[PDB]
Every structure is written in structure tokens, then in C-alpha cells.
């Protein structure tokens, strides 16, 4: 991790949900295209990408090591379990302590039989409008792993729900909330809960920039303005959450660097300063991910 560079707080470089979703677009494995995307990011000052694909989402450590070697970008890999509909059957049968020890080993020993080690517990998720019993179990296991290793936790919210409940659960199990960042806060008008999450001590992410099907970038910007008016940009981080082949520029998509080429300039034009952007893209991630 290079704290002098910009950081994308929630991205995938190799993820394969094509089996779960019966959809080849969800097999993001196009190495040559992704290397070019990483080079594109570097050219605009992004030097860190926090990679959110844990083991059973189709993580590929060797692929990530190869991307770093080809491009020089820093990738922080993760350990964890995703969300209820996607868990392997063994999440149910193994104990909390066993799931925790798995994450600890991925942080301390390495992942996928390589020299690469997990640097964050992520993206650990909850379902839409509820936390299932197995999701609670994963979160409790994540808390244990965080306590043993000190690595921060990055979550998944489904349709921007249950963030406050995730925080309450993690805190109850000894996680200081300054070590938690809540994913996908920008899929709906969500200001009231965002303000409560920031007040509790957590970081929040607008990590679905460009996903306008779900919710317009225009409204993301308005929320960011509300946060800026309140002096809370020091707890906000941004990303694209690239997850699909169709998101890549080589496939006609907007790509990872859309954040810099398109979204940030809209943000600037709407009244943000260079300093405001540096806070969200450099200072916050350097504070949080190290
Ligand atoms: Zn997610
Ligand atoms: Zn993701």
C-alpha cells in the first residue's frame, strides 16, 4: 500500500459469480484488459486498489500477483465470506472459531497457496433488509479475526440496508468502528443512515459510482454535497466496484478510471475543491487501510 497515491476502496480484479448467477458476464477474468485498466489508473495517480473478492467469490491470488508485477499497482487482497445466498455449505457446519481461524491464516500465512496475504476482512455482507443466522456467524468470526490480527473490516450492504445493524454487531464483539467501512452506501437516498453511521465512528463508501441502472450518479453527488456541507468528507471513500466483463472499456464499458476521468470532474464542476477530492481519494484510505 502506497499512502502517497489515490486508492479505490472497493474493486474486483478477478471475481467469478458466473456459476451462482448463470451469467458469463459475472466471470471477470480478462487479464490483458484488466492490466491495461490498472495502467490507466496509475496514469491518473491511483496506486492502490482494495480487492473485495474473498475465496468463494472466485478470488485468484496468482492473477492478482501477476497484475501487480505487470503494472506496479498495489492490490490489497481480502479474506472473508460474502453473503447468505452465496455461502458454501460448510459455513453452516464449521464452527465460528474455525471460520475465524481461516481468515486469520489467510492474513498471516497466505492465500490460494501463494505468497500473497490478505490485508483486509472483506467484503463481508448481509442480505436485503435482514441479517441471516449464517451472516451473523460470519460477522462474529470476522470480529474475532480482526481482534487477532488488527486488520480492518469492509462490509457489503444489499441495496444499502442493515449498515447500522452491522456496526452494532461488530462493535458488540470488540471491533472499534474506526476500523470498519460500510460498503454500497450509495444505492438509494440514504443520508439519514449515513449520518448515523458516521456519527458511530465508521467510514462509509460510495462505491457504486457509474451503476446508474440502480441509482443516478446525480443523486450520489447531491448526497456527497450534503456530507461536505456538514464537514464529514473525512469519513467517505469512493470506488466503482467493477464486477462484470461489461464494465471493462475493452468490452465497451466505462472501466475503472471512469471515477477519475468522468465522475470526479462532475464533482469538481459542482463545487468540490481539489482538497475535497484528496481527502476522499488519498487521506481517508491512507488513514483507514494501513
Ligand atoms: Zn458487495
Ligand atoms: Zn464488490
Structure characterization notes:
The protein has a single domain (1-290), classed as TIM Barrel. The protein is globular. The termini are close together. The chain is 42% helix and 15% strand. The strands form two sheets. An eight-stranded parallel beta sheet has the order 1-4-5-6-7-8-9-10. The chain has a two-stranded antiparallel ribbon with strand order 2-3. The chain is of the alpha/beta class. β4 (46-51), α3 (61-71) and β5 (74-79) form a beta-alpha-beta unit. The structure holds zinc ion (ZN) (2 copies). One zinc ion binds at residues 10, 12, 52, 123, 241, 243. It is classed as hydrolase. Keywords: PHP fold, hydrolase. The assembly is monomeric. The entry is titled "Crystal structure of PHOSPHOTRIESTERASE HOMOLOGY PROTEIN FROM ESCHERICHIA COLI complexed with phosphate in active site".
Please give the alpha-carbon distance between the first and last residues.
Answer: 7 Å
What small-molecule ligands were found?
zinc ion
CATH top level label: Alpha Beta
Individual helix count: 11
What is the H-and-E element order? EEHEHEHEHHEHEHEHEHEHH
Alpha-carbon Rg, integer: 18 Å
Helices and strands: which structural class? alpha/beta
Q: Describe the strand arrangement of the main beta sheet, using strand numbers.
A: 1-4-5-6-7-8-9-10
Write down the domain tally: 1
The CATH superfamily is Metal-dependent hydrolases
Helix content: 40-55%
Q: Strand percentage, roughly?
A: 15-25%
Give the second-level CATH assignment, the architecture.
Alpha-Beta Barrel
Number of strands: 10
**CATH-defined topology:** TIM Barrel
- Main beta sheet, described? 8 strands, parallel
EC number: 3.1.-.-
GO molecular function: hydrolase activity, acting on ester bonds; zinc ion binding
Family: Belongs to the metallo-dependent hydrolases superfamily. Phosphotriesterase family.
Subunit structure: Monomer.
Amino acid at each position: 500500500f502506497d499512502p502517497t497515491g489515490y486508492t479505490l476502496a472497493h474493486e474486483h480484479l478477478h471475481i467469478d459469480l458466473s456459476g451462482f448467477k448463470n451469467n458469463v458476464d459475472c466471470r471477470l477474468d480478462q487479464y490483458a484488459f484488466i492490466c491495461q485498466e490498472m495502467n490507466d489508473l496509475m496514469t491518473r495517480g491511483v496506486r492502490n486498489v482494495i480487492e473485495m473478492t474473498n475465496r468463494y467469490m472466485g478470488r485468484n491470488a496468482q492473477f492478482m500477483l501477476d497484475v501487480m508485477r505487470e503494472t506496479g499497482i498495489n492490490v490489497v487482497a481480502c479474506t472473508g465470506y460474502y453473503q447468505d445466498a452465496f455461502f458454501p455449505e460448510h459455513v453452516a457446519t464449521r464452527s465460528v472459531q474455525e471460520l475465524a481461524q481461516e481468515m486469520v491464516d489467510e492474513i498471516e500465512q497466505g492465500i490460494d497457496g501463494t505468497e500473497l496475504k490478505a490485508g483486509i476482512i472483506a467484503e463481508i455482507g448481509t442480505s436485503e433488509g435482514k441479517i441471516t443466522p449464517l451472516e451473523e456467524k460470519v460477522f462474529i468470526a470476522a470480529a474475532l479475526a480482526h481482534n487477532q490480527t488488527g486488520r480492518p473490516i469492509s462490509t457489503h450492504t444489499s441495496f444499502s440496508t442493515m449498515g447500522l445493524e452491522q456496526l452494532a454487531l461488530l462493535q458488540a464483539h470488540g471491533v472499534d468502528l474506526s476500523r470498519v467501512t460500510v460498503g454500497h452506501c450509495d444505492l438509494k437516498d440514504n443520508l439519514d443512515n449515513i449520518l448515523k453511521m458516521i456519527d458511530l465512528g465508521a467510514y462509509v463508501q460510495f462505491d457504486t459510482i457509474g451503476k446508474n441502472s440502480y441509482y443516478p450518479d446525480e443523486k450520489r453527488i447531491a448526497m456527497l454535497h450534503a456530507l461536505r456541507d456538514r464537514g464529514l468528507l473525512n469519513r467517505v471513500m469512493l470506488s466503482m466496484d467493477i464486477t462484470r466483463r461489461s464494465h471493462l472499456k475493452a468490452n465497451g464499458g466505462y472501466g475503472y478510471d471512469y471515477l477519475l476521468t468522468t465522475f470526479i470532474p462532475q464533482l469538481r464542476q459542482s463545487g468540490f475543491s481539489q482538497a475535497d477530492v484528496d481527502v476522499m481519494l488519498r487521506e481517508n484510505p491512507s488513514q483507514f487501510f494501513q
